[PDB]
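Q: Predict the assembly, please.
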Amino acid sequence: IVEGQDAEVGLSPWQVMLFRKSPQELLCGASLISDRWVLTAAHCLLYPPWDKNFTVDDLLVRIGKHSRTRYERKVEKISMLDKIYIHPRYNWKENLDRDIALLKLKRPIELSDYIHPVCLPDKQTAAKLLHAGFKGRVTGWGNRRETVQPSVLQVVNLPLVERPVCKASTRIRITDNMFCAGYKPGEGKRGDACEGDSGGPFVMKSPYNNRWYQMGIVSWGEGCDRDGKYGFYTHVFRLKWKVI
Amino acid sequence: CGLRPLFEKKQVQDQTEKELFESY
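A: Predicted assembly structure:
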């Protein structure tokens, strides 16, 4: 999370962190969307370009944490997956299209004041909210900048950007299953998720019902806080895939 | 869902929330 800020305790209840079990290793971010379903990006589990094909037995999840190292004893809740679901039409050799995966936990996590499900968007909310200029929120423990491992969960609010602008800033084929956000060269403000932040949530707060809806999943990008480049996120709504 | 127990529930705003509505 480049240019982020230390998250207040309990800021993102849905925050989940993907870990390679042995050796311990923070692989990616992810979000809790029910007491037994986690939402994350496919490339955190399957990305042949860097020979990566994770099974359930190779993954383990930790929920309710704050620091990236220490164990949150009266707060944290470690749980193992029981099955993985990667979108059938996920495009890894081209433009990371449909970069989405569901992780079914083995034992339903028990909610607390530090662990609570994020809401999936509905047409109304998705329609009234997904508008250029409106800033969403990204959280994560990724690189403090590009080659960097944050102590406390970082947070940063980012403004959504117009599709044309997004498409123009990259040779890569942008598809309707992804949007992009970040400040423009000149607004005099910075920030951006970064590798490692991957699989994390890009959420937006609805003033109708005062609740947090998840709008995108940190997917790809070129660099981290590069000028004139914006991060892309899987478009959760266009993907609301049925597996549950 | 989406009603964080230590903020929404307690009826309290977090540091950066202002920005969100402000940008709206």
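Chain A has two domains: 1-12+118-237, 13-117+238-241. The radius of gyration of chain A is 17 Å.
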